[PDB]
Amino acid sequence: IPEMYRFVKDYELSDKLSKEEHQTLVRIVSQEQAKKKN
Amino acid sequence: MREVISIHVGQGGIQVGNACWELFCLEHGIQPDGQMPDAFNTFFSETGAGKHVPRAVFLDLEPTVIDEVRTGTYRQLFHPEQLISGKEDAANNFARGHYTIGKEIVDLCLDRIRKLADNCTGLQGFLVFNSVGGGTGSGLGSLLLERLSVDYGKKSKLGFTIYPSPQVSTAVVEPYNSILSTHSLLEHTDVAVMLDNEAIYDICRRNLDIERPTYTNLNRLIAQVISSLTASLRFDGALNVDITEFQTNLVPYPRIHFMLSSYAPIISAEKAYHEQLSVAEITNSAFEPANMMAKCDPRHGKYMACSMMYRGDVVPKDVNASIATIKTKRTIQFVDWCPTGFKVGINYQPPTVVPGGDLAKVMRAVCMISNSTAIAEVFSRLDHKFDLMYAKRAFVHWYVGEGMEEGEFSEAREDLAALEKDYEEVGIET
Amino acid sequence: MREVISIHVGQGGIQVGNACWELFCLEHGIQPDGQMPDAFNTFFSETGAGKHVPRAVFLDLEPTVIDEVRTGTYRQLFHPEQLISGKEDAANNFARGHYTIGKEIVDLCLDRIRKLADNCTGLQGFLVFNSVGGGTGSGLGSLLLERLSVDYGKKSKLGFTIYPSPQVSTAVVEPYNSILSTHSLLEHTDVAVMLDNEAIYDICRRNLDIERPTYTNLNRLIAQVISSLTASLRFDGALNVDITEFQTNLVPYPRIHFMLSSYAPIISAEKAYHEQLSVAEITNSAFEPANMMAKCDPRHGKYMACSMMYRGDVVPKDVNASIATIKTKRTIQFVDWCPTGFKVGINYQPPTVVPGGDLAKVMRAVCMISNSTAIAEVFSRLDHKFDLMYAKRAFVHWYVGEGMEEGEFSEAREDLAALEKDYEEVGIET
Amino acid sequence: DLGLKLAVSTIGYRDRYTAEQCAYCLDDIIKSIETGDSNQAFRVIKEKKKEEEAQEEAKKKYEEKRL
Amino acid sequence: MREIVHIQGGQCGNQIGAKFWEVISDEHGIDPTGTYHGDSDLQLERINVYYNEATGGRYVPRAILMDLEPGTMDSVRAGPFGQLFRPDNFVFGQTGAGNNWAKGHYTEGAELIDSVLDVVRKEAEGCDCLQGFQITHSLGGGTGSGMGTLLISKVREEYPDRIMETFSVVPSPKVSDTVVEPYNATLSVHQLVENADECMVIDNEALYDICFRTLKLTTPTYGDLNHLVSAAMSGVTCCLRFPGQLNSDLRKLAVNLIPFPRLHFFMIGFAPLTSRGSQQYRALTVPELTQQMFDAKNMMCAADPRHGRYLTASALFRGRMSTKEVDEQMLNVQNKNSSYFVEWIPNNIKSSICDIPPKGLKMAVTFVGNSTAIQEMFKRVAEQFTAMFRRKAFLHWYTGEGMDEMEFTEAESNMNDLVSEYQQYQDATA
Amino acid sequence: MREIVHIQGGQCGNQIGAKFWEVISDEHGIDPTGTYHGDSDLQLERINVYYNEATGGRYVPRAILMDLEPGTMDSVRAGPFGQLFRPDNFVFGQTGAGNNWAKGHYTEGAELIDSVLDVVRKEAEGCDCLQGFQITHSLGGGTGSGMGTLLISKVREEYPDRIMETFSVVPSPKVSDTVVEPYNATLSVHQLVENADECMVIDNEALYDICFRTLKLTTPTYGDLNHLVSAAMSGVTCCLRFPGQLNSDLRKLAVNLIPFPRLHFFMIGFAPLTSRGSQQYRALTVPELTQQMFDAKNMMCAADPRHGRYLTASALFRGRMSTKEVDEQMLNVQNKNSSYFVEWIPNNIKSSICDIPPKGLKMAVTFVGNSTAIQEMFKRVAEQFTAMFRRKAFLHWYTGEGMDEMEFTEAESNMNDLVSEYQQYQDATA
Amino acid sequence: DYIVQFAGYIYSKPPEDLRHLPLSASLQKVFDHMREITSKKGQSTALFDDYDNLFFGETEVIKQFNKKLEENPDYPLPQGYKKVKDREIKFEYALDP
Numbered sequence A: 001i002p003e004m005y006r007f008v009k010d011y012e013l014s015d016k017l018s019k020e021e022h023q024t025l026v027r028i029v030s031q032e033q034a035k036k037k038n
Numbered sequence B, C: 001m002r003e004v005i006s007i008h009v010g011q012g013g014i015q016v017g018n019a020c021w022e023l024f025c026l027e028h029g030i031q032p033d034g035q036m037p038d039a040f041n042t043f044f045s046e047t048g049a050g051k052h053v054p055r056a057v058f059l060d061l062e063p064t065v066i067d068e069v070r071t072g073t074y075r076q077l078f079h080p081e082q083l084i085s086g087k088e089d090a091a092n093n094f095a096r097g098h099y100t101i102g103k104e105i106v107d108l109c110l111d112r113i114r115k116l117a118d119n120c121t122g123l124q125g126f127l128v129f130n131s132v133g134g135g136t137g138s139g140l141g142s143l144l145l146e147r148l149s150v151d152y153g154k155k156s157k158l159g160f161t162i163y164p165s166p167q168v169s170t171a172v173v174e175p176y177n178s179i180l181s182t183h184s185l186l187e188h189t190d191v192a193v194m195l196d197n198e199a200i201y202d203i204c205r206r207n208l209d210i211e212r213p214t215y216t217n218l219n220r221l222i223a224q225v226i227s228s229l230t231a232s233l234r235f236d237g238a239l240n241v242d243i244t245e246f247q248t249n250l251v252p253y254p255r256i257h258f259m260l261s262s263y264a265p266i267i268s269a270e271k272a273y274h275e276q277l278s279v280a281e282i283t284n285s286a287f288e289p290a291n292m293m294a295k296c297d298p299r300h301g302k303y304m305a306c307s308m309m310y311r312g313d314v315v316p317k318d319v320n321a322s323i324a325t326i327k328t329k330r331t332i333q334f335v336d337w338c339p340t341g342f343k344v345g346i347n348y349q350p351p352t353v354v355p356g357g358d359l360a361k362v363m364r365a366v367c368m369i370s371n372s373t374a375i376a377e378v379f380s381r382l383d384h385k386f387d388l389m390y391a392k393r394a395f396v397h398w399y400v401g402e403g404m405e406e407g408e409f410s411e412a413r414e415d416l417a418a419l420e421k422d423y424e425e426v427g428i429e430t
Numbered sequence D: 001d002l003g004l005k006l007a008v009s010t011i012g013y014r015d016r017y018t019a020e021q022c023a024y025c026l027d028d029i030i031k032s033i034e035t036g037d038s039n040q041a042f043r044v045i046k047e048k049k050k051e052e053e054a055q056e057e058a059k060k061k062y063e064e065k066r067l
Numbered sequence E, F: 001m002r003e004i005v006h007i008q009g010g011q012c013g014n015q016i017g018a019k020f021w022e023v024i025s026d027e028h029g030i031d032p033t034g035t036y037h038g039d040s041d042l043q044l045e046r047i048n049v050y051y052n053e054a055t056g057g058r059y060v061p062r063a064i065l066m067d068l069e070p071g072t073m074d075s076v077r078a079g080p081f082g083q084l085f086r087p088d089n090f091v092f093g094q095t096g097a098g099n100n101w102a103k104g105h106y107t108e109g110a111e112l113i114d115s116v117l118d119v120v121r122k123e124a125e126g127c128d129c130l131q132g133f134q135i136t137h138s139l140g141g142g143t144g145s146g147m148g149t150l151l152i153s154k155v156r157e158e159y160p161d162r163i164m165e166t167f168s169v170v171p172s173p174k175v176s177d178t179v180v181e182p183y184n185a186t187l188s189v190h191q192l193v194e195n196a197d198e199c200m201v202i203d204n205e206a207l208y209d210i211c212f213r214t215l216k217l218t219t220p221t222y223g224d225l226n227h228l229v230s231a232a233m234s235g236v237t238c239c240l241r242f243p244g245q246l247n248s249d250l251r252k253l254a255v256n257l258i259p260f261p262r263l264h265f266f267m268i269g270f271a272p273l274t275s276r277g278s279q280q281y282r283a284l285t286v287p288e289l290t291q292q293m294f295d296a297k298n299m300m301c302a303a304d305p306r307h308g309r310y311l312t313a314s315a316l317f318r319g320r321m322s323t324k325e326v327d328e329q330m331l332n333v334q335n336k337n338s339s340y341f342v343e344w345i346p347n348n349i350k351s352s353i354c355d356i357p358p359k360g361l362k363m364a365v366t367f368v369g370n371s372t373a374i375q376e377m378f379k380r381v382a383e384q385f386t387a388m389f390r391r392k393a394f395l396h397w398y399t400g401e402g403m404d405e406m407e408f409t410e411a412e413s414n415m416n417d418l419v420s421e422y423q424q425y426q427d428a429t430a
Numbered sequence G: 001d002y003i004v005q006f007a008g009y010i011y012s013k014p015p016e017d018l019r020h021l022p023l024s025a026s027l028q029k030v031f032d033h034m035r036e037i038t039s040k041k042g043q044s045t046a047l048f049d050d051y052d053n054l055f056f057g058e059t060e061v062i063k064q065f066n067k068k069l070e071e072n073p074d075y076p077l078p079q080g081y082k083k084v085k086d087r088e089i090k091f092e093y094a095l096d097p
């Protein structure tokens, strides 16, 4: 999660995506990845 | 790695610089020859082996005072070619020292300033001393401040100007150049401290019990105030204060930076030890209106912010217990938009005594720098004095014939009117 | 196994040779009698037992100065028959000392040069000193250089010529022979250093604080510069420089080899020790335009290459940290086609002091030899002075009647025009 | 470059290094053919040293003539 | 394992650390030379929590010291136990902030913080298992309250899952030493709530009150306040360095004392505290410890805890004692004071026991309670802030370095929202 | 067996050798009189690598010293350990080159080199099994950069199968001491790539940076730079003179660090390096060594290694340590920095362990990495060369000794081709 | 999958709401922004600018072969490694094509 947010910061996209929005995106992707694996 | 450079211009400036430079040399153990028989670095510089050189420059167009300096006991201390001297005096004419003879000397002074600044690595700021009621002092101070404000920019400059007394005066034309110099340093100096002679005469008479004082006694008190202000940079303390930590605490607005000082205790050895000199009584004496270092009444106006320095064995809890008592009193009232107005500094080194001087040795002392709304009275009375003679254009021909324009007098009057209106506008409650 | 031979011709040349030969004898511990009570070998030679003989020859047609030399305290030092003297002076006439009386003396000088050269095994090169604004000096210097350029060929020769000041002059006809001698040594000398008297007078007045200098004070500074230049051949150093390592570093093109020198620090013992004399401040003082040893303004032109020598306890990292600061400054700009222009030399031996002299003893010093585009101004002003009198053919009869042809004046003018055009062509960016 | 890289690309991966070395070498005669200097087919002072050596040798040869 | 690193900033934080590390070293028997000379085996088992190991067997704290001026760290090095700190961890600037929050957070603090973040990253990446960070700084100063809080955000951005502690001294209106305290207090509280996992407020006024009333010593000094703060600091992590009946790391306290993520501002207190003359009268028992622990005057803050209701409470007992007595006393202190405990969360007191008491004491208690009474401090801070801001006093100093009034308005609004939503739960009922 | 001979040229190379041989002698316990006084048996087993044996039991280095001027070798003989060198190996001329590459490579260096080649052939034909030669010289000087590089070609022509080392100091544009540095640097790099099997660039600027930042000593001198270079030089061949877990001679490094025959320009660094005051704080561990080894500021070149990608790397650990830790740390330093390692060659770090540490140290590491970041040095050298050459500045000095501009054009073109084809592999992908 | 969700979310908000375009337009805008930042960082961009630079050493030859394969659909090559069928997609604004 913090490494992906560092990608967002390094590409000057942190103004478009908050930390909380980033965590929510990661959570939603994690959920669907886990459902697909199962 | 912290440094400060002091500028002395004019007869009064040089005579107070001598006074502060005996005191610093005595306080750091340096003999008058400059030889010791890591705190010195603020005012001095090491030459590699032996002597120390002050970070000071002396300026004057009239050579008598510099020649007196270069033959006294301190001839070996100062660098021979930083005592810049002229040939012809400005003779109390402001236009002379700003337009005619000061311009040819100012370049050498600026070269010396650069040569001193390149040596420093942690330059805190500049100090300048000048008696305002004189030609060369006010004019060269104005020109130097104007050059420094653009050569260096954001570096802090402090001005210890000596304004004329309300009624006591030595010249007859000093209101003109006082007003012009106030115009010049209003937009060019970060701090200005009031130092008129009459208040200090009264202080000496009442406390020191001297009935025939001379200028040296006044200059020693001023030197003690300077030492108390700059002690925090070169001695260990429980609550330190730096020069750059002033415009954030004493200057509410960029225009308002004229404040008046006080010192306590002032007492002679003949009756000093009979009383205990507690911190409460000295901090009460410091706030007494009769102990102001400038002849102004603080009871006639509000306070804006008080910055007050202690040194010695004072404990912070005793300081707080005394600030509370002052907040309690009904005769001292602060401005509405300032709930807390005190900045406190505590240092451990007690004040040093100069042999053969007036003050005795004590373990506790307090120096206050207070910004108050009552300062507008000196501006009003100087303005009234100026208007009386400017109505008939008296003494103007001595200024118009030295290159200054006719309209230059009016705009200084307008700026003083603006300052007086600003002081009234700030002091009203919301 | 490294040697150098110095040639002194004319009154000014002999009077500066005396100045350098007190200094060398003092620096190597040799008494004026020539007796010591392996570094000497550069300037001296061992006789087998006892005294040392300088590798120098003194030339003049007018016997007064040589007779003064042969009776002073240094009568025992020089070999009796290397002080070649004439009977009749050239009397400021260039044609005399190049065509009439110099030819009969030049053979003895060349025989002495051969007899001195056969002794040396590692001959680095020749040094020559001559005041340009005189008959015998310029004429004999030209003739000797022309003979040496063909007798020896590729051996390096260095010329420490003293050109006349811009406005201050002792003679009235010195532009003529100055221009002719510049013509002669333009195609015959590998290095020429500018030495006009007015700049050194200003240096003495400003720094040494002498208001009435004489020629000896000037010659001592020149001797110090020579010693600083040649120190690297006879003392151990961290970064050595040889004489032959100059035309590869300071001479971009064969025609351009006139450069101007500077020295720092120059200070008296009365105020020398009050300041630390760091390497940064001395290397800043050396680049000041007012401290040029020739009255030319470097701010009026570009720099081409700077070769600058240190001696004392200087550390290379401090030198680099100061070269960076100079590259930073906006008032000093180098030519476009030269990215790096500094050659640095460091030596350990501090400069030696001459008793009863002006300079004090210091541990650090810097001597710079800088080639700059601004030197064309002296050529232009000398050319303008020459043209004024050559328009009416004034004073020409004193030269035509001494065997010189009429057209010889014009071609020197054409060569100066060519040199001035070349200096303009080089200084333009690509 | 061109035509020689398309010819090197028609040679199997095992011999492609050798073909690339031959193509660089074939670049070798071509420059000479293009230009005319038989000394570009591998990898004051020179002239002076050669001249001096030849002169000394010539003197020795002169001595051989002398012989 | 599960160790933490120490980071301190500003003068106040440096002075707090200078006693905290002395207390820790005395507890673990480490001499000021870094050599262990302890008596018990347990003194070395968990020394990796605060100390690193180097060659030669000596120990070095993993502390990072930062300030914008070099004086305080140049002074702390000469004090006792000053040699333990690694010289590499000292990072400082040459200018200072002058109690201006903008300078220490936007212009000067932004460029310097890269170097200190480098060493912070070096320290954290290396350690076995990170537990977290603890921060000591003051909210009454510019450089501290700016650089520390920006460093909090930078650390939180890189280690979102670790725990973060902050011991923050807020400026009380009683003992005021700086006039611009409300501005940088209000600006700092805005950023501190968003990133700090735990915050512990400490007031100088409460420390003076405690020293004057409980210890009854005549002359308090900063050394006594620092010693009390250091004992309180050490008491929190004692069970993480020593065995006990119920170990409880910092994360366990974080779980049990913070009901909602924005309510993490605690006030603490230490027991027992007795005067020198009455240390023989008293008998140390669990009832005696718990009656002093919940005493209102014993809190390290001037906030009156019987003006609100505790959301939760925590106690960290030290020494060997029976658990049944501790539990029954905790129940009794909660049954007799049901009016001051919120009713919709039952059993809101956490207890822990550590078998290793402080050196010299047989029993000790550290109290950390989350109460609604803390609203009064933010109320008075905001009151002074809005009294000073309505006239835009001292605003130009902040606005001259890229800051605007909008960030002041947002900070005031967020602080008022925090004040409101903190008391929202005080009136909440089930 | 498998021994190497030492050949040095120029002043810089002689000064490097004067410390390299002192370091080697101190490592093997050889007194400055050539008598062994060591403590351990291993100190004598492989002494044939660098030292020869003579009658009387004393040892003599197999070093050859050459220069075009006698001063430097006449000075190194009087220094410590100066008597070890055999007087027969001293070869010198009487003229010098004057920093002119043409003179030291075509006219003067060609005639003298026969005598030095005679003694070189004598030394190589005699020795048991030749391993190779190592060369120390500077690219900033004329005689060195000319005669050394021509000697490289002459040696390579006679021993095509042996290995050849060169430690070359290239002139940095920051600290420039000679104006004609670009010419003889560019001319030398042309010849150096064609014949040297290995080349190691060293910069004075990087040495000053290291001395000022890591060791933090006030006044660097050439002795410290020489000592660092000498330690780095000794570290490479340590395992060839002492037993170890994985012996690795110079040829094994040549196989593993040079992917293509024209890419053999490495930059090196030595660890650990600590200040005097912090030598007690640090603990010597493999992680501590490897973190400093890959540090960018630790490289002996100003080239920034995170501006490119490593083609390969090598490390030569010293002291007794576990191999598992070394391998895992090498893997970790390669997994965390995958962006700076080229991807089409996996496992591109070579490691070696020697059980004999340096005298006074328990662990040491020598780092030799082939990186693409070295292009920046050739870029700036060529930039200065083309800035100076376009105006044909200083060209006549070179063209007057048989050289022409065609050899300058070919050298520039070949150097640019090297720069291009060195970075060609940086953008290459699999 | 995260990059697809990220692109879809960022460009679903004002001021740059791209929800009226295909989700590929939001994802392309992320890559265009990444290209712009990569170019700005003063770091190599050849992999972004030259899509045919997929293979080591022969990039120019492949570019010339691709031009010949596109100019005339199946240009016979004397020495080319392999023809790969690729798909290009263009968007055309045509009413009822």
Ligand SMILES: Nc1nc2c(ncn2[C@@H]2O[C@H](COP(=O)(O)OP(=O)(O)OP(=O)(O)O)[C@@H](O)[C@H]2O)c(=O)[nH]1
Residues within 6 Å of the ligand: B009, B010, B011, B012, B013, B015, B016, B062, B089, B090, B091, B092, B093, B131, B132, B133, B134, B135, B136, B137, B138, B162, B164, B169, B170, B171, B174, B197, B215, B216, B218, B219
């Ligand atoms: N406090 C104090 N004030 C002084 C002293 N000497 C002069 N003054 C004041 O300076 C005012 C006049 O300016 P001066 O300093 O005397 O003379 P100046 O500044 O050099 O100006 P010129 O007259 O042109 O030389 C007088 O009104 C005095 O009040 C002094 O020693 N101490």
Ligand SMILES: Nc1nc2c(ncn2[C@@H]2O[C@H](COP(=O)(O)OP(=O)(O)OP(=O)(O)O)[C@@H](O)[C@H]2O)c(=O)[nH]1
Residues within 6 Å of the ligand: C009, C010, C011, C012, C013, C015, C016, C062, C089, C090, C091, C092, C093, C131, C132, C133, C134, C135, C136, C137, C138, C162, C164, C169, C170, C171, C174, C197, C215, C216, C218, C219
């Ligand atoms: N720097 C310096 N210049 C001198 C000295 N003596 C003479 N000159 C200069 O030499 C110029 C004239 O040449 P001189 O050296 O005096 O006489 P000369 O070179 O022997 O030529 P003659 O007149 O024929 O004897 C004058 O313009 C002076 O400026 C001296 O001692 N020091």
Ligand SMILES: Nc1nc2c(ncn2[C@@H]2O[C@H](COP(=O)(O)OP(=O)(O)O)[C@@H](O)[C@H]2O)c(=O)[nH]1
Residues within 6 Å of the ligand: B238, B239, B240, E009, E010, E011, E012, E015, E016, E099, E138, E140, E141, E142, E143, E144, E145, E176, E177, E178, E204, E222, E223, E225, E226
């Ligand atoms: N406990 C304690 N507090 C201190 C000490 N020194 C200063 N303070 C407090 O710190 C406040 C001033 O903070 P300051 O020094 O300006 O912080 P800085 O701006 O980061 O240097 C004052 O109100 C003091 O109450 C000390 O030694 N101990």
Ligand SMILES: Nc1nc2c(ncn2[C@@H]2O[C@H](COP(=O)(O)OP(=O)(O)O)[C@@H](O)[C@H]2O)c(=O)[nH]1
Residues within 6 Å of the ligand: C238, C239, C240, F009, F010, F011, F012, F015, F016, F099, F138, F140, F141, F142, F143, F144, F145, F176, F177, F178, F204, F222, F223, F225, F226
């Ligand atoms: N490390 C080191 N470098 C030196 C020393 N002396 C000179 N140098 C470097 O060598 C360069 C000059 O080389 P030079 O002496 O002219 O070489 P030469 O022409 O062969 O005699 C300068 O740029 C110095 O940086 C020394 O004692 N140690």
Ligand SMILES: [Mg+2]
Residues within 6 Å of the ligand: B010, B011, B062, B089, B136
């Ligand atoms: Mg006066």
Ligand SMILES: [Mg+2]
Residues within 6 Å of the ligand: C010, C011, C062, C089, C136
């Ligand atoms: Mg004469």
